[PDB]
Amino acid sequence: GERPVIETVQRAAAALLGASAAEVDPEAHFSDLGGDSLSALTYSNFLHEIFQVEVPVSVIVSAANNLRSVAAHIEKERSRPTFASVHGAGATTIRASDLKLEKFLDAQTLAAAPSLPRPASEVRTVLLTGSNGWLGRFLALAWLERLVPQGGKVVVIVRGKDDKAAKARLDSVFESGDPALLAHYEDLADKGLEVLAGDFSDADLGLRKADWDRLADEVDLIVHSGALVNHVLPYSQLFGPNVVGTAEVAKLALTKRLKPVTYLSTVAVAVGVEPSAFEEDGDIRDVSAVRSIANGYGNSKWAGEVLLREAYEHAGLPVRVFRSDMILAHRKYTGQLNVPDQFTRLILSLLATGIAPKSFYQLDATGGRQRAHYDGIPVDFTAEAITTLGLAGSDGYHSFDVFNPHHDGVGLDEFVDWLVEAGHPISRVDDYAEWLSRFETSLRGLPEAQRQHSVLPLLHAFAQPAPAIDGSPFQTKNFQSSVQEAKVGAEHDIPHLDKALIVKYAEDIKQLGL
């Protein structure tokens, strides 16, 4: 450097986050100093310009990495598939034809892949990614409930300095003030959960070579729920976690014996296509073969689907893709809701400000409230459905759109009615434009703790009232009919969102102390 690299790394962090330059010890972590994925991008671009090497946001925010690791990464880079080698350096568009398995996996794996032994008839061991995430924790719990009674095992890869720290990170997400959940988790975890520290963007999933080789022999099925889920980051930042990560998962599925892959995806892969032309269960390579650079998020998840489709075509790897956005709170376990998402932020904001519009949707010609539907599914149903259908996917390639398709007239205005019925003081402001300005003023007047958990960062989305759509514009038949045939839950169908769920949001928000 000029100047050793670690010093520039510490000073930049100190400047960016407002620490004292003695509190920016090289063993400290970016998140412990007040950092998050917004400031991590600023940091990444700053160090990128100074040292002329890529410093991905994933390296900065990972629980395994401290500021020393960031410095080490920079110096290693100055003296592994990338955006340049796959899509061409500085490219402004991307193509499905770019994403071939030859660019991610070695030739020996690919050559031996077509003739590999077929999936095991009985699933006893499952590898799960993203288990400390919002959806993944309940996928983990669903698999433990099934496999522990049959003497089976759930293997889990979590980011952390070592296996101990990784397990502690997973343990803590089940601590939400619900004693029954914690006892249920700990009972099952002792009997059937193996936690390994790792990182799916790295080679051999960031594991010890002996563990990777063991899993290639031992794992019957792979559930890939892990990803960097960020709607503002560009495709270049999400390439490592979401595209290369998916390729590394596929590599394990195409070694020793074939392992069916459940892959989590998003409605954001339909960005660039009209909703009516988006075939739920079509070939994703045909449904959008070319794309421009939630744009990066959508593109990254799309790219993962393409690679898994290539793996199916090359070796007959069974795949089940599940496209899911806005996975709402657990209906039974208290304190279990996705705190950062837009829906939770909105509900918290309405309770904090105590004011709501006559309608979030467009009014009719006579100024009245129209019929509308909120597309959302609770996590407890979603986890059971994905696990049931994924377990049944030992042959072929199929995709499901995990959305709420009901033409039931249950939307945001009904949720506000239900909060008022339950006793929460929410006033109904008649004019939408008057609401929005009053809402923004009241939000800005809240304490610092509450403002950061509010919807204030996402206020641009509420500028105009949304269009009054009942049902969902995307096709769901494959998911809904499969759920009906499999007879999932009490409903034997995708559930309707109800008063009990909305009332529970308010109690969850209080219980977590927001």
Curated annotation (Swiss-Prot):
Q: According to the UniProt entry, which residues carry O-(pantetheine 4'-phosphoryl)serine?
A: S37
Altering D325G: what's the impact? Does not affect benzoic acid reduction rates but leads to alcohol production. Displays modest benzaldehyde reductase activity
Q: What is the effect of changing L458Y?
A: Loss of activity
Listed result of changing H231 to P/N = Loss of activity
- The UniProt record lists the Carrier domain at 1-78
Q: Which residues bind NADP(+)?
A: 132-135, 159, 169, 199-200, 225-227, 265, 297, 301, 324
Its biological purpose:
Catalyzes the ATP- and NADPH-dependent reduction of carboxylic acids to the corresponding aldehydes. Catalyzes the reduction of a very wide range of carboxylic acids, including benzoic acids, heterocyclic, phenylacetic, phenylpropanoic and fatty acid substrates.
**Know anything about its domains from the record?**
The N-terminal domain likely catalyzes substrate activation by formation of an initial acyl-AMP intermediate, the central region contains the phosphopantetheine attachment site, and the C-terminal domain catalyzes the reduction by NADPH of the intermediate thioester formed from the attack of the phosphopantetheine thiol at the carbonyl carbon of acyl-AMP. Large-scale domain motions occur between the adenylation and thiolation states. Phosphopantetheine binding alters the orientation of a key Asp, resulting in a productive orientation of the bound nicotinamide.
Protein family membership: Belongs to the ATP-dependent AMP-binding enzyme family. Carboxylic acid reductase subfamily.
Per its record, how is this protein called by name?
Carboxylic acid reductase
Output the lineage of the source organism: Bacteria, Bacillati, Actinomycetota, Actinomycetes, Mycobacteriales
Q: Which gene encodes it?
A: car
